[PDB]
Design a protein around this ligand. Structure first.
Ligand SMILES: CCC(=O)N1CCN2c3c(cnc4cc(-c5c(C)ccc6n[nH]cc56)c(Cl)cc34)OC[C@H]2C1
Ligand SMILES: Nc1nc2c(ncn2[C@@H]2O[C@H](COP(=O)(O)OP(=O)(O)O)[C@@H](O)[C@H]2O)c(=O)[nH]1
Ligand SMILES: [Mg+2]
Length: 168
């Protein structure tokens, strides 16, 4: 039948990993979503005429290492590294998430997409050029997104699925 793509969404607390995922799946913006809930969500989509089942792990809880998390990253086929465009700290943190994923995959060609979320906000502290330059250095696409307006949301996840396809 149809292909499954195991996607993992990573990034600092409060960048809108949950909000991106609920927007994608349910078409609503959640103004407040339990910061602690870490769960996988499944949704069937059409991408370039191919029917695709996405299984999306939305990370949350606490800053702690677990062999369970290593297992989710190990099974994960592709990653969305999410920061918020009004939060330089979340941008500085991208490095750390990407390093942990590489730690477990023990490899360099892992499908990933850099995502600058909350693009609906006027109060930017990370310029597009900076994020572009980072994504160039990582060898991965950059997509600006807004969970609130939906701008870029389908593009982000579809781009990651195409990145997984290009690798497989
Ligand atoms: C509002 C709360 C929130 O959103 N979070 C999401 C992120 N979470 C994390 C951090 C910092 N480092 C993290 C590292 C890993 C992680 C990766 C990426 C890969 C392999 C791993 N093995 N064990 C842990 C691993 C993960 Cl899943 C989560 C982290 O700070 C905030 C906290 C809670
Ligand atoms: N303006 C705006 N707010 C957002 C957006 N994405 C998430 N938020 C808000 O930022 C907060 C954190 O979002 P959440 O999805 O819980 O962050 P997570 O901790 O990364 O799961 C919530 O109050 C969300 O409404 C966005 O694209 N634009
Ligand atoms: Mg969340």
């Amino acid at each position: 039948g149809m292909t499954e793509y195991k996607l993992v969404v990573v990034g600092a607390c409060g960048v809108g990993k949950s909000a991106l995922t609920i927007q994608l799946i349910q078409n609503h913006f959640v103004d407040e979503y339990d910061p602690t809930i870490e769960d996988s969500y499944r949704k069937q989509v059409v991408i370039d005429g191919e029917t695709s089942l996405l299984d999306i792990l939305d990370t949350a809880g606490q800053e702690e290492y677990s062999a369970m998390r290593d297992q989710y990253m190990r099974t994960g086929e592709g990653f969305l590294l999410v920061f918020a465009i009004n939060n330089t700290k979340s941008f500085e943190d991208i490095h750390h998430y990407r390093e942990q994923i590489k730690r477990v995959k023990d490899s360099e060609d892992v499908p990933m997409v850099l995502v600058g979320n909350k693009s609906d906000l006027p109060s930017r502290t990370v310029d597009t050029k900076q994020a572009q330059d980072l994504a160039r250095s990582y060898g991965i696409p950059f997509i600006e997104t807004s969970a609130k307006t939906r701008q870029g949301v389908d593009d982000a996840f579809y781009t990651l699925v195409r990145e997984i396809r290009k690798h497989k």
